[PDB]
Symmetry: C3
Subunit: 440 residues, 3 copies
């Protein structure tokens, strides 16, 4: 009963990019994916995306749930939708035609668009909006969509404009296109021509007006791309605020569309949350914090730090200026202070690494203490090695732990030491020279 | 002659918080405290705050200057103000009734509110404002405050709305409430009912209209809380700019309400100043700088750094990426470079710690030089120790100074050394091994 | 044929600064320089800047291309322009009179201003604009410029105001001033008085209206200075976006007026680019990145780092939290990780310094590897020294390389070592003590 056609064929030269226009991201995902998500709201029985230049590229990612069709020749929107003929020809119902570059339209508006369509038995309904600066846009007279050039000194005053989003009765849509194309006397034909045909035939043409004009934004250049990110950012942050998350400045906090955040979390300005990130209850995120594809538990405090593809338990304190790199896990109540880098290591609960430390490829136990300046070495030039540090070990400041090596439970390393051999449990490893003063 | 009643009883379920609503902060202090500060402007002979859930909590901080009264049962604003009867009953004068959730109202407006009250001998004056979207708010007809539901197809057009802030003649206020409550035929009664009673009795009811509608904002959820921080931020930064402080972007700089800043200071965007912080003349604060409960002198340059509960003299340069922790003091012209952490230490003038260094619990003299990579160790596992470093000492790069220990004036430590014993004045301490090459 | 007079004499007491008002910067250069750049658009045969207090200071920088004249006495704008008499007296043509504190006016508007001037043969044309809050500004009746005080209950309604920018026929301009000054019966005389004289004489006085009122902004205090930076920031970022640069938030990115950025560059919010900075194609700049007077190549990724007066080749990755200091050069595909400081050193291609490292005054070859914690020492107290590190050298973690010293190609340093003597090619230098365990 409901069908959807997504127009996603290049031609976006104002973007000054080699990437297909619809692949440019907005709050974490491509414009095309935001459009697929809105389209899902109408629960279309079938969906077809017309692609073009770098066709496979657009398919080489956001594929699967959707049928694709390629157009090797660009002859306008009419032609583009004509390329979906092989799949929608004959079926009865309602067909939504939408551009892959209008990422701000919501599922709720698409739905209101169809409802209106049916509630008036229209043959075609134009999604429209009102602006005080109609310049350029096609004007809505419903009788006909007058273009800017073909507009009369009078018509150039119509506030209501065409958003380029439509709903047509599937049977008549392909008919009109088939017709226009042959008796067009021109090469390229636009989808708005079909609106012209229903005018001739006296068929019913409705128009749904959007409440918010800004949701109709079509992205043609990077100025409109930034505007899209601005609206999407406000939308995302608004939902988080209604859900109990505090923002010092929601106009300057950057949270991707799929990030999950528990109520009571507090977010200072200029925090960045990307990908599949998740934040537990009562966690505090301070200015400069940057988190990507990670999980942060409840009661944590992340201070001006960078966390990537890692997991952080409840009550962890990180920062300021720490870097938690891929595949690290920080156990409950762990503390990572300033200028510490943790990479590919698991760290047991209550362990502390408060300063200028590098921990890579280690399995670390609980209640371990890393003195300021501790460095793990697990790279020789071609191969890496792992290090095991037991529970309750004390690693003196400015030490160098050279892997492969193991430190047993409760062992201790003296400051300034260089460890090259296993240190047994309860032992004490020292590898530093003796001090020698010299008067005058 | 002037009395004030502050309504601060829970019921804020849209906040999704376990903290009493009025305790949520805006620019450094609770909404309740911003309201107390505005209220002080009318110089009320007596002030009473009606609290409720977590009553003690609200008292367990912002107490002292104000009388509190608890309401174990929530039966509306009428009931809430009725709880202050034991204290304001009988007194003559003017009584301001204000919610603890309207933190943007200024003392100047409260004052204009009273003046208006007296200048018209009103019995009650409603603080009002005009908006183009009156939906939801009580409409002002002065005759009566028509609610959204009880509003006629006509009345729902009144632009002027009720802010919920009022001034009543104290004697008649408690009378009407006492009355309504008994012949109410209902449990809960609203303070706006008193406006209804004065209508019956034909008493004079005025209305003061605020010039700025946004100052009337009542905070019910975290979206309005962010709006309150946005307005308060602009207000605070505006005053600093009029006072000679330059801001690269005052819409994105976060300065708490009590921070003091001398004229000629320059502030880049995204700087955060909290608590009792004070900044001296001509100081430059760059992007990312975060200062809490600290004092910074004149002529300093703080570059992307974090400073907490410390004192910084004139001409100090800090950063980028340095962390000055609690109870540290940096003398005149001291320089702390990148990746340096200073914790609980005093540092004499002209001393320099330019790179990757950790200085904790030390008393440091003047003209000292910390080579890159120097680490102080004053933690054994259960106990801490102090270190004294005299004037003009040179601490070679990558050294480890293990406390307790002392370095005498003009002494010197060789790079890569580990110091465990006192180093006498003018001496030279070395604790590093010898280098051994190996051909091929 | 075209002449220009720039009014830049102090009197800006609301700025609370000891610097001449026009010297305050906006997006990297003084307000005066933005005005010179707009003025150049009219291609003036001669340009004269009237200075005053700290006269030399204004000349001690933005000099050269312009004639200066000092006024030791402040008797108004009429007097100020009278000081340029010695140079413009007698010449025929058109003379633009503009204040050094209106940095937002564009060259395109100045040009439209002259065109209008000539297209109407006016004797004088007032650059005007319309605002809904004319309060304070001089009203435009063209007949006369009525001031706020001398305005009639009616005139105080004129929406069109005087921007203080004018074009006069050079011959008549000095005539009227010469006249007014003698029969003024007052000390100070304003340039708007000349508009009064042409009214008496019945001469033609036109007015060009600006499309954007905000471009007329005169900066008198730091609140308007921030507004100027806000408009200039939007203008600069807009041009970059039209040119192919992506901005996550162009309202919070700080790019100086002369920074050059190649298309396809991606810029996260809160990035700062200053001075003569240049960014190559497809480079990614993340939140917190701060670049000053540097060149970054194509395909680089700068993550939250500070780069000053340096050069960075193609494919370099820097950050997070690295500091590249003055006079450093990073070769192609070099990698500088977190907490690394590079100062005055050249670094060959593919070299890697991934953690907690300080590299100063070194010449480093290609394919070198700096293990975490490596420190170069080239400071003794009064003198500095250089270090040469050949190609393919491996510098073990936590080492100390003490200059002057040299490491030959393919040599290697063992971790925890202190190097004080040259290390020959293919050799292996070790300077660490031996580890000694201790049971229980
Ligand atoms: Ca274990
Ligand atoms: Ca001393
Ligand atoms: Ca070579
Ligand atoms: Ca070290």
């Amino acid at each position: 009963s409901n069908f959807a056609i997504i127009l996603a064929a290049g031609k976006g030269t104002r973007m000054k990019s080699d990437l297909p226009k619809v692949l440019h991201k907005v709050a974490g995902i491509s414009m095309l994916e935001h459009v697929f998500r809105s389209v899902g709201a109408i629960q279309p029985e079938k969906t077809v995306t017309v692609v073009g230049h770098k066709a496979e590229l657009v398919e080489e990612v956001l594929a699967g749930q959707t049928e694709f069709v390629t157009q090797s020749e660009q002859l306008g929107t009419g032609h583009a939708v004509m390329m979906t003929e092989p799949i929608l020809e004959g079926l009865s119902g309602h067909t939504l035609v939408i551009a892959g570059d209008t990422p701000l339209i919501t599922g709720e508006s698409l739905k209101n668009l169809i409802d209106f369509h049916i509630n008036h038995k229209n043959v075609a309904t134009i999604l429209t909006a009102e602006t005080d600066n109609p310049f350029g846009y096609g004007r809505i007279v419903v009788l006909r969509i007058v273009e800017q050039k073909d507009a009369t000194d009078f018509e150039k005053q119509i506030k209501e404009i065409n958003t380029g989003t439509y709903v047509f009765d599937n049977e008549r849509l392909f008919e009109a296109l088939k017709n226009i194309n042959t008796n067009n006397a021109q090469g390229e034909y636009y989808i708005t021509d079909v609106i012209g045909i229903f005018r001739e035939t006296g068929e019913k043409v409705g128009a749904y007006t959007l409440k918010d004009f800004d949701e109709s934004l079509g992205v043609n250049d990077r100025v409109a791309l930034a505007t899209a990110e601005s609206v999407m950012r406000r939308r995302i942050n608004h939902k988080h605020m209604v859900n109990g998350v505090s923002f010092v400045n929601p106009e300057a906090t950057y949270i991707d569309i799929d990030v999950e955040i528990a109520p009571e979390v507090q977010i200072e300005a200029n925090v960045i949350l990307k990908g599949q990130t998740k934040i537990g209850a009562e966690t505090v995120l301070t200015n400069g914090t940057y988190v990507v594809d990670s999980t942060i538990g409840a009661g944590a405090v992340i201070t001006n730090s960078m966390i990537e593809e890692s997991s952080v338990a409840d009550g962890v304190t990180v920062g300021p200026y720490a870097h938690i790199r891929p595949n690290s896990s920080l156990g409950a109540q762990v503390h990572i202070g300033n200028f510490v880098e943790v990479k590919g290591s698991s760290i047991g609960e209550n362990t502390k690494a408060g300063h200028l430390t590098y921990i890579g490829n280690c399995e670390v136990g609980s209640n371990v203490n890393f003195g300021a300046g501790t460095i793990t070495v697990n790279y020789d030039g071609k191969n890496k090695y792992k290090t095991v540090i037991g529970d309750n070990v004390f690693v003196g400041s400015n030490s160098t732990i050279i892997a492969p090596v193991e430190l047993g439970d409760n062992s201790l390393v003296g400051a300034g030491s260089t460890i090259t051999k296993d240190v047994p449990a309860d032992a004490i490893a020292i590898g530093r020279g003796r001090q020698i003063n010299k008067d005058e």
